[PDB]
Design a protein around this ligand. Structure first.
Ligand SMILES: Cc1cn(-c2cc3c(c(CC(C)C)c2)C(=O)NCC3)c2c1C(=O)CC(C)(C)C2
Length: 209
């Protein structure tokens, strides 16, 4: 069963701005997604200090970058806290409402698209390079879910039928035809070195066979 939801008015407006604005510095999408993954990892690591059983679903705390030239997809895998059904539909969207409003007010006031992370809505920078984003997530307190959006004001949430994750999040970016440079080993290495060199978790770039 697939449930369809409309994005909050402010979010739909932000997504339209990210997709239609001419902005060449698209590489910032990777540091934003890596930062979300890093925050999820910080969360589970902190929680595990008072409750060690929170790591029964996996002890390894890492980030995996998986480019796929055949499928034209860039996958970001983390073994972070994951997201519940409530996080995907209500909680993160509620927090994102105030952040989006502030970011759009700042953009009008002279700020550029790269400052998106300061407003906590960095996830949506994925739409600078992706036509569709799929989020596979598993939190200790919930089942495995699949969130998906090609923008256009709506998103879908379904219980994931695929391979079990244990704990964490998989962000699958179905890249735009002209954004294939983000599938190149050399380009990903350069972006990670320039923007994510001090992330406190191992970042493993999966080389294509
Ligand atoms: C804000 C925001 C932030 N993120 C987001 C995106 C991600 C993660 C998190 C949680 C950590 C920051 C603790 C949040 C995460 O756990 N891993 C990478 C993807 C999303 C949003 C959304 O509005 C849509 C969403 C729920 C599909 C994803």
């Amino acid at each position: 069963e697939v449930e369809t939801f409309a994005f909050q008015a402010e979010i739909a407006q932000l997504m339209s701005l990210i997709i239609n604005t001419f902005y060449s510095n698209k590489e910032i999408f990777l540091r934003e997604l890596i930062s979300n993954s890093s925050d999820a990892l910080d969360k589970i690591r902190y929680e595990s200090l008072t409750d060690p059983s929170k790591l029964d679903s996996g002890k390894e705390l890492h980030i995996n970058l998986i480019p796929n030239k055949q499928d034209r997809t860039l996958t970001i895998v983390d073994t972070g806290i994951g997201m519940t059904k409530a996080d995907l539909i209500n909680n993160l969207g509620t927090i994102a409402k105030s952040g989006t409003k502030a970011f759009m007010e700042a953009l009008q006031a002279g700020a550029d698209i790269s400052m998106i992370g300061q407003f906590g809505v960095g996830f949506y920078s994925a739409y600078l390079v992706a036509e569709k984003v799929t989020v596979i997530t598993k939190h200790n307190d919930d089942e495995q879910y699949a969130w998906e959006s090609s923008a256009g004001g709506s998103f879908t949430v379904r219980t994931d039928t695929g391979e079990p994750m244990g704990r964490g999040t998989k962000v699958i970016l179905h890249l735009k035809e002209d954004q294939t440079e983000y599938l190149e080993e050399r380009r990903i290495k350069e972006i990670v070195k320039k923007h994510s060199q001090f992330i406190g978790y191992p970042i493993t770039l999966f080389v294509e066979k």
